[PDB]
TrEMBL record, chain B:
This is Envelope glycoprotein gp130. It comes from Simian foamy virus. It is found in: Host endoplasmic reticulum membrane; Virion membrane. It comes from the Viruses. Signal peptide: none annotated. The leader peptide is a component of released, infectious virions and is required for particle budding. The mature envelope protein consists of a trimer of SU-TM heterodimers. The N-terminus of leader peptide specifically interacts with Gag protein. This specific interaction between Gag protein and Env glycoprotein may allow particle egress.
Length: 53, 49
C-alpha cells in the first residue's frame, strides 16, 4: 500500500522444552552383578578321607 | 595441546572434542563473520585481490 509493504504477523510457539545432550562415559564395571553372584556360589566339595576306610 | 598435556586414552579424547565443538558452535551461532577495513576506500587492487 503506497510505497510501504506490509507483512503478516508471525505466530509464536507457546512453550519450549529443554533436553540437553549428555556425554556417555560407557563404564563397564556397573551392570556386572552376575559375576559377583557367580563368585558367591563357589561350592567347593571335600569328602572326608578315612571315614570310608 | 590439551590432550597431550593430559593423558587422554583415545576414548576421553572424543569426549573432549565434543564439548569443544558444541561450545565453539554456540559461540559461532551469533557472530556475523565480516572483515576489518584496514586500507583506503579508493584503491582497486585490494578489492580485486
Ligand atoms: C543410559 O542407559 C541407556 C541404556 O543402556 C543408554 O542407551 C544406550 O546408548 C548406547 C550408546 O549411544 C546405544 O548404543 C544403545 O542403543 C542405547 N540403548 C538404549 C536402550 O537406548 C544411554 O546411553 C545411557 N545414558 C548415559 C548418559 O550413559
Amino acid at each position: 500500500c503506497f510505497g510501504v509493504t506490509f507483512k503478516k504477523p508471525l505466530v509464536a510457539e507457546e512453550k519450549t522444552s529443554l533436553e540437553p545432550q549428555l556425554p556417555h562415559l560407557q563404564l563397564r564395571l556397573p551392570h556386572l552383578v552376575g559375576i559377583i553372584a557367580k563368585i558367591k556360589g563357589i561350592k567347593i566339595e571335600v569328602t572326608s578321607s578315612g571315614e570310608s576306610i | 595441546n590439551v590432550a597431550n598435556s593430559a593423558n587422554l586414552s583415545q576414548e576421553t579424547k572424543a569426549l573432549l572434542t565434543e564439548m569443544v565443538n558444541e561450545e565453539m558452535q554456540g559461540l559461532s551461532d551469533v557472530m556475523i563473520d565480516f572483515e576489518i577495513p584496514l586500507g583506503d576506500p579508493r584503491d582497486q587492487e585490494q578489492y580485486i585481490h
